[PDB]
């Protein structure tokens, strides 16, 4: 997959990514350059995204989360909701090809009292 739990987001160079950088609020958004990098954020009740995912030059799916401790609300590091499920989005099948067998479900989620509507691919 290769799964891999990842480190604090930090700043990624404005010349290493191929494609868009998705961040998960848990809602899938697309972040950009200056005012695509600095993905610094704490958990999204307070802060912008739980984690992100992109793709470097070498064709490797790069991820970043926040410091690891619904349990996703407490500590989630991006697209993966459970070990068996991740948040669906356009570049999901690029960024996560091993998951093409996953069944997709529509779900609801509350973060800091605001409702998010997401699609999830599970197992």
């Amino acid at each position, epitope marked *: 997959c290769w799964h891999y739990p990842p480190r604090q987001c930090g700043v990624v160079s404005a010349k290493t990514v191929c494609g868009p950088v998705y961040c998960f609020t848990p809602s899938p958004v697309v972040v950009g350059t200056t005012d695509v990098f600095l993905l610094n954020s704490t958990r999204p009740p307070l802060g912008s995204w739980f984690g992100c995912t992109w793709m470097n030059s070498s064709g490797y799916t790069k991820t970043c989360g926040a410091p690891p401790c619904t349990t996703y609300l407490k500590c989630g590091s991006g697209p993966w909701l459970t070990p068996r499920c991740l948040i669906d989005y356009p570049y999901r099948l690029w960024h996560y090809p091993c998951t093409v067998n996953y069944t997709i*479900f*529509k779900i*609801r989620m*509350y973060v800091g009292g*605001v*409702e*998010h*509507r*997401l*699609t999830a691919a599970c197992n």
Partner: antibody
Amino acid sequence: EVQLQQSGAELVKPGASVKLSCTASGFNIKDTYIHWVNQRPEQGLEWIGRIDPANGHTQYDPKFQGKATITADTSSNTAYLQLSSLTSEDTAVYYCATSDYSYALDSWGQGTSVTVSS
Amino acid sequence: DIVMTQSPSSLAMSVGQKVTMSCKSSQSLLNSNNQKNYLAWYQQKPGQSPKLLVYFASTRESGVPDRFIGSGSGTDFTLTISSVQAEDLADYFCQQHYSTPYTFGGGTKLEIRR
């Protein structure tokens, strides 16, 4: 916040057809099923059908097959209910609602009042 | 189609009293793979649109008072309001959200005795 804004009241002659709209905000309708339900005056609730805006795929109560058609335009976050060959018996309030995978109707528009009359 | 039947057709209780209403489905609403019952309860205040109270027979919707309590399983379901408030006057509907077409009960009209 999940919100459903429905179009305005309709007068429509018998035999005629009408198209209602349901516009969502604060979320993307792709991630929901949009349902339509009707409520005849002083009466109960009745499911018409639903659509998967990610799919285009729709499901109906067979009794409404031929008279109702649900569609959705994801670029404007709007779903539609087209009704055709209306009669006085279709005079009703038409609601749209969101569900997740569960099909329980978790959020509802304000409703659209449709009068069928000559 | 699954037939939903609600009881009673109307209710009148004074504020503070416990309210009880029931819902019978023509067959089980129990998802075996899930162990959940796909029954929902809705509240419709006069002139307003229906609003979801309970789903999966007992899971209470976010933002709904704790006095609202759904229970039961199999083919027998109840919604209870532990101590009723003046603002709770409404029609209440059960719905099986198990299989198409997702059918509703005929509704219980709740009024306030004063």
